[PDB]
Amino acid sequence: LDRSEAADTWWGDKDYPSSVVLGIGKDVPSSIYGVTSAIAFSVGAYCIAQSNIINILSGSTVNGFYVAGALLVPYSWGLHVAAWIQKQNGK
Amino acid sequence: ERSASIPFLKKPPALDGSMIGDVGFDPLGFSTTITELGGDLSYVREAELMHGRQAMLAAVGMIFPKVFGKLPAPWTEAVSTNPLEAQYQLPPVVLGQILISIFIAEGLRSRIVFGNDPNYVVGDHGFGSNFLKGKSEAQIADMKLKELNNGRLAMIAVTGMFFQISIKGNLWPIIDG
Amino acid sequence: KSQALPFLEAPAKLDGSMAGDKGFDPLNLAGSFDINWMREAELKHGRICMLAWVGYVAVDNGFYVPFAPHVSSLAAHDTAVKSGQMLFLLGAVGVVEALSYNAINEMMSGQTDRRPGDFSMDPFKMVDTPEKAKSMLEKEISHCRLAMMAFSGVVTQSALTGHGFPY
Amino acid sequence: HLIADGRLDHAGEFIIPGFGFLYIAGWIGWAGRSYLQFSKKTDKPNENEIIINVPVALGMMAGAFIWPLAAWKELIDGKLLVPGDEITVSPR
Amino acid sequence: WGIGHSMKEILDAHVPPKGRLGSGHRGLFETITDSLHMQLGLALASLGVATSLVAQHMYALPSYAFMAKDYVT
Amino acid sequence: AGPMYDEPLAPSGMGREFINKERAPLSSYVGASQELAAFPGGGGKEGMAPTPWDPFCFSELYKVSANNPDVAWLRESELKHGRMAMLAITGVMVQSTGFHLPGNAEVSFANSDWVSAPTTLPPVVWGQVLAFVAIAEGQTSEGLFDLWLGDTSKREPGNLGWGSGLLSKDKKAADKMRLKELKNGRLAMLAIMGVAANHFIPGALPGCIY
Ligand code: CLA
Ligand SMILES: CC(=O)O[C@H]1CC(C)(C)C(=C=C/C(C)=C/C=C/C(C)=C/C=C/C=C(C)/C=C/C=C(\C)C(=O)C[C@@]23O[C@]2(C)C[C@@H](O)CC3(C)C)[C@](C)(O)C1
Ligand SMILES: CC1=C(/C=C/C(C)=C/C=C/C(C)=C/C=C/C=C(C)/C=C/C=C(C)/C=C/C2=C(C)CCCC2(C)C)C(C)(C)CCC1
Ligand SMILES: CC1=C(/C=C/C(C)=C/C=C/C(C)=C\C=C\C=C(C)\C=C\C=C(C)\C=C\C2=C(C)CCCC2(C)C)C(C)(C)CCC1
């Protein structure tokens, strides 16, 4: 990737960042971002709790579909940050 | 704009039909990145011809030891007819002397490979070039394309052969055991 | 106005330009993300489901290759995996799928005028002109959607109860 | 063995001596700072630093007993810190 | 291909609100990709930290057989 | 070039003029208390003293740096702590009498130990309470970084919009109600922290019953 092939994303003067920083998610509405963030956080917390807390994680038997979904907690964080960004962008 | 081999992908920018066997087949873009780097495709084309010729020779010499025969057997009686076992069964004398023969050939080739000869044609080492004197340039292109296609086929064939002998121990339509 | 949901209007991106455009997008997913990727994904799912449906139906109505295990299509996956042919087909489709990585990149970047779900397979020039292309694309996408739903029903019925071509 | 983590069962090891030293050290620093503030206003600050005006220096040493309140008052009044662009700084 | 990230874009748009960290990380991509000494310094710092880590971890968690009783090594 | 003795380290054109502008004073906030100014001579009326109380001058610490919060933020935090402490002291007082919700097989709300009362509940029951508090404190908080640097524009300190219409239209009566809020909140803060201190170390609050 060359230095020229890069959009101007700097937003220090502005109060909020442009939607270009979201990449492919620039056009995603804020309501969809927020509701998906809530669903993702709930599902990931449920998966981690059922993997480690409710059942103590045994090496012989780990579900895998609970290991997946545990990654949605960072995804939920990103989704709610993007929800805020889209809310301030009015998009 | 579109490759002639893969008609749903863009033509490779480096390839432009100015080479033998050019059908725009470069999904990854080796020629493209080489041209961005600055080098030419002469090295890759000559390496292609080298590999194709070696694969053709290897394919014939691997279907042979057990087809028409393992020589008159002065010393090769002990060498196994299995090609993958014969390589670890050549004797020291023959092994080293084949080694030095191919070494001197490759060392002679290396200078014209990495030299700055402007008149050098890719795949033109002068070995058996006398037959090309009679033929015309269209015929020359056709014959070079035939050579390239045969080498291209043999590169993949051989590769199969080797694996079939490794995992099954025999080819399907020939070499029953 | 959206025809599927006549109580609201269709999004900006559903404009007829694409085949099978009934103005159906209650969630604005194709407004949220590029629609060419959506159409290519829809087409790919539909072709896989069409071939899967007809293959399931034939294997259940006796259609096997020489040197094949005579097994119902439900356990055909496991038996073919054990035989190893499954991995050969995996490589065969993986070649086309990596070429599809390249094709999708070119389509989205605009380096080529590639339509979604297009690999330039027209031996019989079935769509060499615009109106033929529109008609045949609408008919395909209809078949894609219908076979997607039909195969979901089939495989599930098969995994739930019974067997045979009917279920 | 002295335990210095914050537990009040062993306060006398570090916490009480710590506050005592902090008070004494702030006393010393405040006396020095206040004497410097005086000595600069004088006609000959350079000679006032090497020949101490003891009559007022003892006054500053005494008055520094209440330094935590005096320091807070000067901070609130903006007289503890010199602003940032009134102090030399080298070429960055 | 298209998927991925642009480090220039990431650095440029990572700037906290109200100019807490000045203009943020604008221009750092240019300086790092132009200056080999900054890259060398970052690599050396990371490798020194890694060397300290292996030194601290080999003795605490020996991985090779019978090395624990080999005191000189 | 502003109220602060130093220019903010935030740069020009990226926040400096936003931080270094004029800010409202402590005297323009409804927090004065007649009780402190309850002695012969100088004194106040209507429950308010003529001047506010700030021996440590935390209100005007912004002039030293913009790291320190503004009086808008401090009033927001004061009203938040007061409201939370009022609910907390009412809750402990009601719970210690033994009154509790009906309950069932799954949940048992019978526990007079306010310290360990949440521990008795199932994970879901207190989970809902904490989740509601987490969502609301976080949704209602918009423009709080603006109240820190001082821009009481978008957000008034303590005005979440919940029942703000019931405030009287007269300025005097509105300020009277706000002062009643602040006084009850501060009393509840002292009460709840005193009960907690009494629990942790006995004898901290001699008038305790819990
Ligand atoms: C291909 C690589 C590989 C292989 C062969 C194994 C094999 C094993 N692991 Mg696993 N493991 C791996 C990678 C791998 N691991 C990775 C990357 C991690 C994260 C650091 C772990 C962490 C881990 C832990 C903590 C434990 C095991 C254990 C096990 C055993 C049972 C696991 C099981 O039944 O999962 C079956 C699961 C599946 C068939 C589906 C898995 C699909 C995943 C979730 C896809 C997504 C991956 C993700 C993006 C990668 C980043 C990691 C992310 C989760 C943070 C087995 C010996 C257990 C063990 O041996 O205990 C004595 C055990 O306790 N593994
Ligand atoms: C002094 C001297 O000599 O001068 C020379 C000079 C000069 C110019 C060099 C000359 C020349 C020409 C030369 C050297 C010509 C050499 C030609 C040669 C030696 C050409 C082999 C091709 C082989 C191919 C394509 C193999 C395909 C192989 C394939 C596709 C397969 O069979 C596939 C398969 O096997 C698998 C993979 C697995 C099995 O289950 C199934 C089968 C069997 C089907 C001269 C003029 O003649 C003389
Ligand atoms: C001068 C200069 C330079 C240089 C620099 C350097 C040399 C640096 C270094 C640095 C360093 C060398 C650093 C380091 C750091 C570190 C850190 C920061 C760490 C962290 C950690 C953590 C975070 C951890 C955590 C954890 C975990 C994870 C687990 C366990 C527990 C704990 C907690 C421990 C350069 C070149 C750049 C250029 C410019 C200038
Ligand atoms: C408790 C405790 C602890 C802890 C501690 C800590 C954690 C601390 C911190 C600290 C800190 C973190 C601090 C900071 C600071 C800052 C600043 C910024 C300062 C300033 C100062 C000044 C400015 C001064 C001045 C003066 C005065 C006032 C007096 C004298 C003179 C002078 C001038 C010097 C421990 C564990 C150890 C244990 C023991 C106990």
XYZ file of C-alpha atoms in Angstrom, chain F:
210
model
C -5.694 35.019 27.511
C -8.409 33.645 29.768
C -9.453 32.913 33.351
C -6.644 30.384 33.748
C -3.233 31.580 34.901
C -1.668 29.340 32.224
C -2.680 28.669 28.654
C -4.002 25.091 28.309
C -1.482 22.631 26.915
C -4.171 21.621 24.443
C -3.133 23.338 21.198
C -4.592 26.313 19.385
C -7.213 25.323 16.844
C -7.748 21.952 18.575
C -9.287 22.946 21.929
C -7.278 25.775 23.519
C -9.912 28.462 22.960
C -12.614 26.013 24.084
C -10.925 25.382 27.462
C -9.601 28.914 28.081
C -12.935 30.771 27.783
C -14.968 32.406 30.549
C -16.659 30.043 33.019
C -19.511 30.640 35.441
C -18.615 31.274 39.106
C -19.474 29.285 42.211
C -21.668 32.137 43.476
C -24.130 31.488 40.609
C -24.967 27.993 41.945
C -27.743 27.157 44.412
C -25.760 25.582 47.233
C -25.375 28.218 49.944
C -26.418 27.068 53.417
C -27.729 29.327 56.179
C -26.601 26.842 58.836
C -22.924 27.594 58.256
C -23.780 31.314 58.322
C -25.965 30.827 61.425
C -24.386 33.028 64.087
C -24.825 36.565 65.451
C -24.123 39.339 62.978
C -23.430 37.992 59.505
C -26.021 35.498 58.339
C -28.411 34.410 55.630
C -32.126 33.790 55.161
C -34.455 31.285 53.486
C -31.990 28.476 54.184
C -29.213 30.071 52.089
C -26.104 31.945 53.200
C -24.973 35.067 51.308
C -21.797 33.274 50.134
C -20.923 29.643 49.356
C -18.731 27.370 51.461
C -15.366 26.339 50.027
C -12.502 26.437 52.568
C -10.207 24.409 50.287
C -11.163 26.359 47.120
C -11.607 23.235 44.998
C -14.175 25.144 42.922
C -11.607 27.579 41.479
C -8.790 25.048 41.031
C -9.436 25.174 37.268
C -7.386 28.376 37.077
C -4.270 26.365 37.784
C -4.952 23.722 35.215
C -7.610 22.172 33.083
C -6.818 18.899 34.518
C -8.967 19.875 37.497
C -12.757 19.745 37.009
C -15.079 22.710 36.625
C -17.784 23.737 39.093
C -20.337 22.381 36.615
C -18.778 18.919 36.877
C -18.503 19.245 40.650
C -22.196 20.127 40.986
C -23.108 17.245 38.669
C -21.113 14.846 40.841
C -22.523 16.350 44.048
C -26.100 15.901 42.890
C -25.320 12.384 41.664
C -23.789 11.372 44.996
C -26.636 13.014 46.892
C -29.345 11.277 44.885
C -27.595 7.910 45.161
C -27.071 8.382 48.899
C -30.707 9.373 49.425
C -31.853 6.196 47.708
C -29.235 4.213 49.636
C -30.128 5.554 53.082
C -33.844 5.104 52.409
C -33.149 1.567 51.209
C -31.133 0.539 54.250
C -33.662 2.145 56.605
C -36.567 0.327 54.939
C -34.717 -2.998 54.697
C -33.512 -3.043 58.308
C -37.131 -3.057 59.525
C -37.452 -6.538 57.983
C -39.911 -5.523 55.266
C -39.161 -7.430 52.072
C -40.791 -8.390 48.802
C -42.807 -11.646 48.648
C -40.264 -13.907 46.946
C -40.668 -17.468 45.722
C -38.685 -20.706 45.555
C -36.030 -19.165 43.299
C -35.561 -15.809 45.078
C -35.547 -14.986 48.797
C -35.531 -11.266 49.615
C -35.423 -11.926 53.389
C -32.184 -10.433 54.716
C -31.780 -7.545 57.158
C -27.984 -7.277 56.785
C -27.781 -4.408 54.306
C -24.057 -5.030 53.766
C -24.651 -8.660 52.725
C -28.170 -8.138 51.333
C -27.017 -8.229 47.668
C -24.970 -11.377 48.334
C -28.075 -13.412 49.217
C -29.834 -12.746 45.911
C -29.392 -15.008 42.865
C -27.035 -13.838 40.094
C -29.917 -12.655 37.903
C -31.711 -10.518 40.491
C -28.857 -8.138 41.318
C -27.583 -8.522 37.764
C -30.670 -6.724 36.475
C -30.175 -3.895 38.985
C -26.515 -3.442 38.081
C -27.293 -3.636 34.354
C -30.017 -0.988 34.642
C -27.693 1.309 36.580
C -24.887 0.676 34.080
C -27.058 1.452 31.047
C -28.722 4.530 32.544
C -25.490 5.947 33.986
C -23.880 6.033 30.562
C -26.936 6.881 28.483
C -27.988 9.907 30.545
C -24.312 10.987 30.581
C -23.837 12.928 27.342
C -21.782 16.103 27.387
C -20.139 15.360 30.735
C -16.692 15.897 29.237
C -18.195 19.236 28.226
C -19.134 19.970 31.917
C -15.600 19.194 32.963
C -13.915 21.680 30.781
C -16.715 23.988 31.669
C -19.145 24.369 28.846
C -22.474 24.377 30.689
C -24.439 24.744 27.498
C -25.570 21.436 26.213
C -25.962 19.995 29.690
C -27.041 21.711 32.890
C -25.487 20.160 36.037
C -27.990 17.755 37.543
C -30.715 18.224 34.901
C -31.288 14.761 33.478
C -34.706 15.895 32.230
C -36.515 13.538 34.627
C -39.378 15.481 36.161
C -37.747 18.846 35.508
C -41.138 20.247 34.488
C -42.418 20.092 38.065
C -39.898 22.776 39.044
C -41.709 25.999 39.846
C -41.659 28.793 37.291
C -40.608 31.378 39.879
C -36.831 31.645 40.161
C -36.942 31.998 43.955
C -39.049 28.873 44.469
C -37.055 26.872 41.910
C -33.847 27.762 43.739
C -35.535 26.907 47.040
C -36.445 23.435 45.774
C -32.955 22.906 44.348
C -31.448 23.921 47.691
C -33.768 21.503 49.495
C -32.538 18.790 47.121
C -28.898 19.628 47.804
C -29.369 19.769 51.578
C -31.222 16.453 51.753
C -28.649 14.862 49.461
C -25.742 16.031 51.593
C -27.475 14.879 54.777
C -28.145 11.475 53.203
C -24.516 11.208 52.075
C -23.322 11.889 55.610
C -25.885 9.440 56.997
C -25.078 6.531 54.683
C -21.324 6.946 55.033
C -21.745 7.226 58.800
C -23.719 3.988 58.926
C -21.075 2.305 56.758
C -18.281 3.596 59.005
C -20.201 2.451 62.081
C -20.512 -1.017 60.555
C -16.836 -1.247 59.589
C -15.554 0.172 62.902
C -18.148 0.186 65.733
C -18.640 3.441 67.598
C -18.077 5.734 64.611
C -21.736 6.851 64.780
C -22.935 6.718 68.426
C -26.578 7.272 67.444
C -26.622 4.179 65.236
C -29.319 1.516 65.303
C -28.092 -0.591 62.343
